[PDB]
Amino acid sequence: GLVGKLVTQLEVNCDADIFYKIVKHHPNVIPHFFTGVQVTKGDGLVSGSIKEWNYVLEGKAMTAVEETTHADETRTLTHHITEGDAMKDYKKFDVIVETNPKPNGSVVTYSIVYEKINEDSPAPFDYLKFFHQNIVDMSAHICSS
Amino acid sequence: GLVGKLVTQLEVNCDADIFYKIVKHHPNVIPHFFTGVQVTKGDGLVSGSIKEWNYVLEGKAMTAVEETTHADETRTLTHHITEGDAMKDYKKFDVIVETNPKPNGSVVTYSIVYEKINEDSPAPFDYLKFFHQNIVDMSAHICSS
Ligand SMILES: COc1ccc(Cc2nccc3cc(OC)c(OC)cc23)cc1OC
Ligand SMILES: COc1ccc(Cc2nccc3cc(OC)c(OC)cc23)cc1OC
């Protein structure tokens, strides 16, 4: 089992497009900072970012290089990791965030698409829980009106 | 975030229908046993089961009552938990296993569909990892020919 995908999906009581705009532009207790740049398309408007993150996951300090892009039409954010501690375990590591209206608020889906270096590599449950708790935190700071 | 779904999806080098038949009818190192019954449809043939499991998850002994059904046409197995330790955290807890051919072997998807009792409940990452490791183990004991 070298290629796979982990997903956390959560219902949120918020219009999909509004929630997407919140996620696209947004905890201090988790140690983290980044340096990097913004990327533009051609009309001079920012379309994404390339960031080098320094962070602490489950007590351990790590770095990652991440390129973020977005698709407003499908309310999708994509984080493509090119370098860093996670690349000791994964040949490929991408995080896709989608927000959609409930067929019925919204459903938010975080998917971690991965390919392991070898069979001794773990699947990224640590990252799934980290992103899940981050999105639960953010969502509990949002309310109607 | 009270209603959600966790997923682990893995690629396997096996025909979908064959892999489904293997999963449908299949580690001793994990402490577990069950008692219970088989369920029939009307032609007298077994269509499912109702089992009371006794097991140890992350060192802790637990019980669960599980009703399993299957859909051969869609290669889907469904495990519906009605009682047990997990129901201290979840109002609803269902595990859905799907096997499909790669649009290209197969893709196996384990989904845990849950509703928490309250916001203090955890999301079932412990169960996701347990089912993931179980399916990785099983799949590493299967080879071509
Ligand atoms: C190795 O995997 C990653 C590691 C760090 C990041 C950085 C990152 N991207 C998006 C949202 C984030 C949100 C975070 O919490 C505020 C955070 O702290 C480490 C990092 C975040 C992304 C990663 O994949 C998207
Ligand atoms: C609380 O959640 C559950 C707890 C136990 C089970 C029992 C079960 N069902 C299917 C496959 C299993 C496979 C297991 O490993 C061999 C196992 O050991 C506890 C239990 C299994 C299912 C559960 O949900 C499907």
Phi, psi of B14 (to 5 degrees): -160, 145
Altogether, the residues listed in chain B come to a count of 145
Say if CB B35 and CB B52 are below 8 A apart.
yes
Q: What is the resolution in angstroms? A: 1.5
Residue located via tokens 């799949």: B139
Gapped junctions in chain A, after residues (C–N > 2.5 Å): 26, 104
Residue located via tokens 């004991």: B141
Other CB atoms within 10 A of residue A144 CB: 5
Other CB atoms within 10 A of residue B109 CB: 18
Report the candidate in A140, A98, A10, A135 with the shortest Cα–Cα distance to residue B4: A10
Query: In the beta sheet, which residues pair with residue B113?
Result: B5, B94
| Distance set, CA A96 to CA A24, A109, A114, A120, B50 (Å) | 12, 8, 11, 25, 37
B87 Cβ contact list (under 8 Å, min separation 6): B81, B93
Sign of the alpha-carbon torsion through B10, B13, B17, B19? negative
Token couple for B89:
């955290």
Whole-angstrom distance, CA of residue A82 vs CA of residue A80: 6
Q: Which of A10, A119, A123 sits opposite B4 (nearest CB)?
A: A10
Q: Which structural domains are found in chain A, ordered by start?
A: 3-140 (3.30.530.20)
Q: Which of B6, B8, B125 sits opposite A4 (nearest CB)?
A: B8
Q: What SS3 class is residue A41?
A: coil
B124 lines ligand 2 (CB under 6 A): no
Say if CB A144 and CB A13 are below 8 A apart.
yes
Which of A35, A56, A79, A135, when mutated, tests ligand 1's pocket best, judged by the most ligand atoms within 8 Å of its CB? A79
In angstroms and rounded to an integer, the radius of gyration of the C-alpha atoms of chain B is 16
Token couple for B123:
């999301």
A4 Cβ contact list (under 8 Å, min separation 6): A114, A115, A123, B8, B9, B10, B11
Residue B131: CA count within 13 A, CB half-sphere: 21
B22 reaches A (C-beta below 8 A): no
Would you give the DSSP letter of residue A96? E
Token couple for A48:
């994404």
In angstroms and rounded to an integer, the radius of gyration of the C-alpha atoms of chain A is 16
Whole-angstrom distance, CA of residue B129 vs CA of residue A29: 26
Whole-angstrom distance, CA of residue B13 vs CA of residue B7: 20
| Distance set, CA B73 to CA B10, B23, B132 (Å) | 21, 15, 24
A125/B129 CB distance under 8 A: yes
DSSP string, B29-96: TS-EEEEEEEEE-SSS-EEEEEEEEEEEETTEEEEEEEEEEEEGGGTEEEEEEEEEGGGGTEEEEEEE
Burial of B34 by CB count in 10 Å (0-12 exposed, 13-18 middle, 19+ buried)?
Answer: middle
Token couple for A129:
């829980």
Say if CB A81 and CB A28 are below 8 A apart.
no
A125 reaches B (C-beta below 8 A): yes
Q: What SS3 class is residue A55?
A: strand
A142 reaches B (C-beta below 8 A): no
Say if CB A134 and CB A27 are below 8 A apart.
yes
B6/A4 CB distance under 8 A: no
Other CB atoms within 10 A of residue A145 CB: 2
Residue located via tokens 């919204």: A106
Residue A78: CA count within 13 A, CB half-sphere: 11
Sign of the alpha-carbon torsion through A64, A92, A11, A144? positive
Say if CB B137 and CB B122 are below 8 A apart.
no
Whole-angstrom distance, CA of residue A33 vs CA of residue A31: 7
Say if CB B24 and CB B93 are below 8 A apart.
no
Report the candidate in B49, B110, B62 with the shortest Cα–Cα distance to residue B88: B62
| Distance set, CA B92 to CA A59, A61, B46, B60 (Å) | 33, 37, 25, 21
A 60-119 residues inside an 8 A Cβ radius of B: 119
Distance (Å) from the alpha carbon of A9 to chain B's nearest alpha carbon: 5
Interface test with A, best of B126, B127, B129 (most A CBs within 10 A): B129
Whole-angstrom distance, CA of residue B41 vs CA of residue B43: 6
Other CB atoms within 10 A of residue B137 CB: 13
Say if CB A109 and CB A88 are below 8 A apart.
no
Whole-angstrom distance, CA of residue B78 vs CA of residue B90: 17
B97 lines ligand 2 (CB under 6 A): no
Burial readout B75-103 (b: 16 or more C-beta within 10 A, e: otherwise): bbbbbbbeebebeebbeebbbbbbbbeee
Catalytic positions of A? 79
Whole-angstrom distance, CA of residue A105 vs CA of residue A14: 5
Phi, psi of B25 (to 5 degrees): -120, 15
